[PDB]
């Protein structure tokens, strides 16, 4: 929906807050429901391999988010506190300014570090759940 098959959370160029708020408007609307040539075959397949690969990649990463406890959810939520040495910005200016392409370059240094913190936090929630299994 965001000019490609992937990247459907919003269109590029719009800020993070304006895109996420516009998605809900697109959510209620889409849910309520209110010449030829023989060489069209080759391009009929090239348009299918891009759609099958985008779906097959979607289901793979949708299941790979089980490492962080965010399986099957496009917008998850964790319990890892946000450092101040990463961005040092308020939640108001991050969502009102700084679109997705600009925000990626802002935390590209630490985007590989945060992936390590999310997995350690998941094992802790699983181990703490296992300890309660001894009682219940």
């Amino acid at each position: 929906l965001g000019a490609f098959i992937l990247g459907f959370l919003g269109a590029a160029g719009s800020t993070m807050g304006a895109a996420s708020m516009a998605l809900t408007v697109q959510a209620r609307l889409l849910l309520s429901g209110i010449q030829h040539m023989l060489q069209l075959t080759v391009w009929g397949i090239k348009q299918l391999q891009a759609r099958v690969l985008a779906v097959e990649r979607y289901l793979r990463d949708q299941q790979l988010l089980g490492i962080w406890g965010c399986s099957g959810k496009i917008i998850c939520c964790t319990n890892v506190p946000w450092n101040d040495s990463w961005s040092n910005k308020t939640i108001n200016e991050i969502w009102d300014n700084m679109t997705w392409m600009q925000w990626e370059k802002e935390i590209d240094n630490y985007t590989q570090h945060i992936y390590t913190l999310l997995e350690v936090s998941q094992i802790q929630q699983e181990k703490n759940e296992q300890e309660l299994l001894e009682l219940d």
Binding site: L31, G33, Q35, H36
Partner: protein, 389 residues
Amino acid sequence: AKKWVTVYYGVPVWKEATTTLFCASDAKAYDTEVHNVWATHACVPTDPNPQEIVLGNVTENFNMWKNNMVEQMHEDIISLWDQSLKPCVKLTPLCVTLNCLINCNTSVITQACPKVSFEPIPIHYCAPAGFAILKCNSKTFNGSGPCTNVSTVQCTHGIRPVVSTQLLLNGSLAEEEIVIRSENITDNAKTIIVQLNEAVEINCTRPNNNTRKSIHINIRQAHCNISKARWNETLGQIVAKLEEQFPNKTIIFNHSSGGDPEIVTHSFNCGGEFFYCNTTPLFNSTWNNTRTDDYQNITLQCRIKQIINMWQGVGKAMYAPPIRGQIRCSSNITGLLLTRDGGRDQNGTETFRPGGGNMRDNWRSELYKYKVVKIEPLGIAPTACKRRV
């Protein structure tokens, strides 16, 4: 107990779509036939393995006079006649936006007129990706009435684009009995479509033998023959059905009541020959439970014309002179278009004059079994569960 609302998904629910349908006809791509040239450039090959899923105990209000699918076929045929028979002089009206002496000057177009071959080909309208086509299977179907043997398909049956008036040519026949269809009877405005259950044949020729161009300062003559011993049987069943709608009155056929020459007479085409066949010795008889014809070869006098009135909008046209000789039309007759003459002067009679002319009514007699529907999967129903919060 305590009802609660829940949302389902994948619920069988239908609606009505307004989409486009791609055609699918068995072309040739090599001959100089017009329909084979058109079908090659915009149609796909026919489905070799069709699948008709028969639904269960379902009922769908198949309205037929409000079908938007027939509004598409009519716009897909007009685009074929602009690629087949190019007129020599296409005189068409054109008005100017001036309130009221409105400026309405004609706009003529001069194009080359090559005499091309002409023969229809059965096409199949198929549903696009994401939609489905329903199909009734009742042997009567009544027209705009809900049937029960609804089955879904993906492509319709063989449909020929034959353009004719007063007698529906080549096409599908009825299943078991001659049924009549009309949007509303007793209002003498809607045409009554009569579908036959037996193919009545017709042969129309002019071998050579009439090279006499003018008379004073004939090549414009042709004829047709109808098997009287076979045609009376099918007509004898039509009056048996019409009297079921009006038992006390008298079925009296008649010729046309006048108008344009494409309505007063029959009109079909065979290789650019626009036969205008006089049908008065076919509807002259008055009727009751007994016959009033005679007692084999009903000479249906025809005539090739050159200045016609287009059916694809207002405006005359003019084609090239006819071919030298050997023009044959080994047709069939599957339908019949009949109007009705009612009123306060109707003293126990029933007049059924031949009508037709509206080509949309020609295809509604063919696309009556189908309907294009989409599948809406949401659904809401009450239940006894409750989301734990």
